[PDB]
Subunit: 223 residues, 4 copies
Amino acid sequence: ADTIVAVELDTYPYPHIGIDIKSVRSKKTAKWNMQNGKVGTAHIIYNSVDKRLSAVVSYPNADSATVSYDVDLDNVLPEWVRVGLSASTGLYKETNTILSWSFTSKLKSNSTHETNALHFMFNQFSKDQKDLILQGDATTGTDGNLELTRVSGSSVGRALFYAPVHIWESSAVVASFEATFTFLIKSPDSHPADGIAFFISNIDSSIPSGSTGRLLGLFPDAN
Amino acid sequence: ADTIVAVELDTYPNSYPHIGIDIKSVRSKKTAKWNMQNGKVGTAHIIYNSVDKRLSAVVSYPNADSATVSYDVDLDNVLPEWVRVGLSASTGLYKETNTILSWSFTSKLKSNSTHETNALHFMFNQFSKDQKDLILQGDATTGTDGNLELTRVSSVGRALFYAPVHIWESSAVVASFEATFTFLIKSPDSHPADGIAFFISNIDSSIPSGSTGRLLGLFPDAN
Amino acid sequence: ADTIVAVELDTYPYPHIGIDIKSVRSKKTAKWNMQNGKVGTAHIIYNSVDKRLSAVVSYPNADSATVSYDVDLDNVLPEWVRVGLSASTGLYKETNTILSWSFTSKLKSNSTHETNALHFMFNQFSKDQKDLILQGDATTGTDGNLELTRVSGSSVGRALFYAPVHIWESSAVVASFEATFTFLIKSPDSHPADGIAFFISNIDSSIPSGSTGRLLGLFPDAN
Amino acid sequence: ADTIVAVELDTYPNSYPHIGIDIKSVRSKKTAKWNMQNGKVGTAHIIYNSVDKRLSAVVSYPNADSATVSYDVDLDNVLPEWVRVGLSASTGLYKETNTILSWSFTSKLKSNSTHETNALHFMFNQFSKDQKDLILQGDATTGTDGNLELTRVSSVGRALFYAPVHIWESSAVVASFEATFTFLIKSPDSHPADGIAFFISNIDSSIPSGSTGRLLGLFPDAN
Ligand SMILES: [Zn+2]
Ligand SMILES: [Zn+2]
Ligand SMILES: [Zn+2]
Ligand SMILES: [Zn+2]
């Protein structure tokens, strides 16, 4: 199937932030205080020296939650990947609006003035966002935002950046990436089941069949 | 026909070697004398912004005089909203190369809104054998020393960045881009005919039939 | 006295955006529709190839105003300078709040991989902002903002970045800078006299005596 | 005494040449074997972030093995909120230089707020004779080839960036910095005693009396 590494924020049947390395059974999780209707901000960072994937989710007035996991991505992910955002809603009326998304990847060689870098920043999505590959119920343009799930009952959507990303190289001394997105989960329900995730996958990843709910449109089954 | 805007460096004795600005036609809209240095690494800096609406280029060599050409033009009226940017090169009948040692690009769309900037930035200082984020056309190849050989080493080649680029938007207060690339044109011949160009085209641009020589793999005819 | 180059927004006795090269008698001006109580955004840009200083002031819902002026800063300003913000209030109750300020300067040499760059971004000012030199009634910390004039009748204040800036060099092929600040001018009065300015000066510039009102704390007299 | 945090590269046979992390004391908190290469340009990459709270360093040479050392430490508890960053070097009694070919630094403070990042970034690829944005101490000088000679060419020298740096803030969700510098240690001697260090100190730090040799111009005594 696909190779997935993802930082997920879910409230399915307890809300927690977690790190998934190829399985929905989070390798590490942290208690998350999901704030309905408030804009949240996830910061994800990783570097080949530390070989540690770290995440921080904070809200204004701020209850930050953070989870880290030691892992050498060189052994998990393919050399070239595509990065993206995912979301799945349970049986509840709710949205998973992405207000902004920015990413930065760098490969520094042994070679002096070594650097290879890719950087994108979306602070406003357009109706025709040709540099985003939308999958599922994901769409753009709504207020300049990115609606991962359909806005108005079991919906899944994803948005991946068009250009493949050279996330690692055997001849780099330090490889590193950093992602940041601001989201808005609004539900009229008091305890909605929902999930958003920043994921890294093989370039041609697609929504597995049956990847709804707890599977975040990332995994085909709970193994 | 494709829509092309390109800054070209050519020595085809149509008639000194010159740097020139092409807006949809090979008969440069503006040109400047260029002192092509065989075997030395050169550096082209291209910059544009919607406020000034002036496309400018500077080509210098170490210990060098620089050559510069600017041209007033509102790209909003020439290019489509979404484009792809790339490098091109055509060799006449001479033994010579068109090695690109580095290429970096940055695009920015700043809206009327407070804190609404959209940006794309890539930097290649070392090209790998499998550069999956570059669309190679013609005789173009990568990996040779970590360089990009646009031409065969009567050759024509191009390399376009994979991700489409949002160059303009009707709602931006200042749209801008800036490109930089270092090249090496080596030829055993004393007066070789050659040509490199940084170009901006429609996303699905391809090498027109018979765009060899003085047509730089960009134009199908001068006529 | 001091050497001043500044992009000013004034409504003194008609509101206009203007470019001042060593004198308060703007070298070029544009009609400005001052919006009381609304956050505005000034973008200032300049590059040595074009040798043109350009400014854009827009508000949300947007009425943008823009003014450009052809000038080779190499002949006006000293090699090393300090950049800053200034404001002066007439006899009115009003504020000149700076919500954010960011600047970027680059010096690219003939030399391959030439770059020298300085970049700062303030999106939140602290009560002890040790990297800012405050002059006059200027203070920080108020909401995380920068109050150029005193907040509650003839007040002048300035804030300059601590580190001197190498704005030009004789051996650079392209020198360029770019500044952006968001301001809030709130006055209970319908037609208040006020002025804010982004200025470049000699490193040890200070508020001239009698630089109030129309003189923006930049000039000592109207010559 | 000054508060010093520094990543040091030393060959003083106190006992192989090593790279080490110093937190307020010259007796390194952590060290790694370093294979000092006489006459070859080296590259030190230093990185830290408040989420991981781990200070890491990588020193590589071309065609090289890299040496790396990391140390868990919350800088919030060691350093003052505002600091100055710099480079240091001390030579033993040998003929040798400590030329810094380039130095770049980036600091970021991201708040709980949506879109509230504060950043400082400098890049020196060429030092001029009058580098007004650098505070030189000891035998340090600039302009020599466009390089920075920390030591006399029993010498000690330092260079600190002029602007104080806000390294931490109690209200930031992720504070981070990253430094990179390329050096050249040439010595006619086969086993020279030498030392370079990237350090972070209180804004008004100065070379302690007798901080020569194995004290790297950073510490007044080991004892
Ligand atoms: Zn889970
Ligand atoms: Zn031509
Ligand atoms: Zn005026
Ligand atoms: Zn030691």
